[PDB]
Amino acid sequence: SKPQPIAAANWKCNGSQQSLSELIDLFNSTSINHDVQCVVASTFVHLAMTKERLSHPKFVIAAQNAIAKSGAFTGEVSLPILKDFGVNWIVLGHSERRAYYGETNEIVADKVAAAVASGFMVIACIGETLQERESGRTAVVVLTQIAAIAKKLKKADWAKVVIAYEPVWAIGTGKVATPQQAQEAHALIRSWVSSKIGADVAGELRILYGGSVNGKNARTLYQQRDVNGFLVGGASLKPEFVDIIKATQ
Amino acid sequence: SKPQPIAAANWKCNGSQQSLSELIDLFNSTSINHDVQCVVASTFVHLAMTKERLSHPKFVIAAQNAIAKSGAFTGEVSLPILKDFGVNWIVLGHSERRAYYGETNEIVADKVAAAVASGFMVIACIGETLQERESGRTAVVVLTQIAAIAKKLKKADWAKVVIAYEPVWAIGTGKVATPQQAQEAHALIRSWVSSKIGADVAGELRILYGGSVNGKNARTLYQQRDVNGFLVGGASLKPEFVDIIKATQ
Known part of the structure; x- marks a missing residue:
């Protein structure tokens, strides 16, 4: 058996009033008759609008980032603000932030923990680069990332947690990931959680x-024992997302 | 004579639905009978709401930050998105971003230039740290910042530009800036613009x-020959802002 699946749309830095409206209408009209949690991560700018027009009950909205505390951080957005706005889902430590925005294992760790403390559901991202993969350090590295996070969490916290595996080594590297490789990375994380936190968790x-x-690939991927879902980029701005949600049966 | 003044509210990483609503109502009810441009920079989260409820015609809204292009920058916000949302003002290269978020003279420069190209009005921030001030490098440094920006601009671009002087050396340093010192920094920037771009600009x-x-200090400060306004932090979340707008007559 599997836990309930998740199909998450990571819109990243994209979207227009018009496009998103249209995209959101498609969703509201879609039939989803299964155990599935659909998540929509739009930009800070569009939360308001998403919040309002997204009415299909199998969907929640999420933020793509946040900082922990409110204050003198011009440009930034705090968890406190999100929660007040009414946002309960959030994506933290995505590869792009790790790469371009100086997010270390510990910054991430810290964010997650705040998020968890304020009662958010967290999609926490981890994954290794090509250098790391090529030298055979996948296990070494992801476990290091997961550990940094778990270090700050209590057993009960895990219930609010979702891990997302990002095969960075295969992202813009002209390298291609296969289902089996996905499955192998996921089986690692799970083994770690099992042996370190509890087979229950x-x-x-x-x-x-x-x-x-x-x-196209969505099905074969979800068919894997340890895959519970997806954190989607590009496709999630197209109607093809709908196909991916269905891939989760 | 002076150009039209600007009273800008930099809300930074703060605010709640309720607070901001109340704060915004005060504004809508205020009498402003002079040449003044009031600017309100709320978080990405609250733009929507500000946009909607701020109805006093002497007010515009602005963003606190942005990146240049849309794309795969999870968490971030592009100029393209703002412009579509209907935002025409923006604060760029604030001391806090320079300090915590890796913004160099060139990143700033680049952002400004994009912003200008897309038809935004830009509040561009510059200022020196205590080390810099103490060693007598104020002139050296600010001119370096302004230059990095001007490097990318055409004469016509300046019309969309607003410079804000941030005396960082005096921010959380237990050091205190006086009006005369403000005036002196401003007179420098102006001298530079004059001699390098044109006495017209x-x-x-x-x-x-x-x-x-x-x-309390607002008046004495604006009374200075080269001060045209303010980019306000803390006070701008209080009703005291209204007092500052009036300070601009």
């Missing part, structure tokens, strides 16, 4: 696949 | 003061 823990997923 | 160019301004 491990078995309800959702692990999302966050490499390239489209309407 | 210099004389219409608005230079905002962006250190600590409250309802």
Whole structure:
């Protein structure tokens, strides 16, 4: 058996009033008759609008980032503000932030923990680069990332947690990830959770696949024992997302 | 004579639905009978709401930050998105971003230039740290910042530009800035614009003061020859802002 799946749309830095409206209408009209949690992560700018027009009950909205505390951080957005706005989902430590915005294992760790403390559901991202993969350090590295996070969490916290595996080594590297490789990375994280936190925590823990997923590969990927879902980029701005949600049956 | 003044509210990482609503109502009810441009920079989260409820015609809204292009920058916000949302003002290269978020003279420069190209009005921030001030490098440093920006601009671009002087050396340093010192920094920037771009550009160019301004010091500060306004922090979340706008007559 699997825990409930998650199909998450990571819109990243994209979207227009018009496009998003249209995209959101498609969703509201879609039939989803299964155990599935659909998540929509739009930009800070569009939360308001998403919040309002997204009415299909199998969907929640989420932020793409946040900082922990409110204050003198011009440009930034705090958890406190989100929660007041009414946002309960959030994506933290995505590869792009890790790469461009100076997010270390510890900054991430810290954010997650705040998020968890304020009662958010967290999609926490981890994954290794090509250098790391090529030298055979996948295990070494992801476990290091997961550990940094778990270090700050209590057993009960895990229930609010979702891990997303990002095969960075295969992202813009001209390198291609296969389902089996996905499965192998996921089986690692799960093994770690099991042996370190509890087979109880491990078995309800959702692990999302966050490499390239489209309407074509989605099925084969979800068919894997340890994949519970997806954190989707590109495809999630197209109607093809709908196909991916269905891939989760 | 002076160019039209600007009273800008930099809300930074603060605010709640309720607070901001109340704060915004005060504004809508205020009498402003003079040449003044009031600017309100709320978080990405609250733009929507500000946009909607702020109805006093002497007010515009602005963003606190942005990146240049849309794309795969999870967490971030592009100019393209703002413009579509209907935002035409923006604060760029604030001391806090320079300090915590890795913004160099060139990143700033680049952002400004994009912003300008897309038709935004830009409040561009510059200022030196205590080390810099103490060693006598104020002139050296600010001119370096302004230059990095001007490097990318055409003469016509200046019309969309607003410079804000941030006396960082005096921000959380237990060091205190006086009006005369403000005036001296502003006179420098102006001298530079004059001699390098044109006395024409210099004389219409608005230079905002962006250190600590409250309802008490506001007057003495604006009375200075080269101060055209303010980029306000703390006080701008209180009703005292209204007092500062009036300080601009």
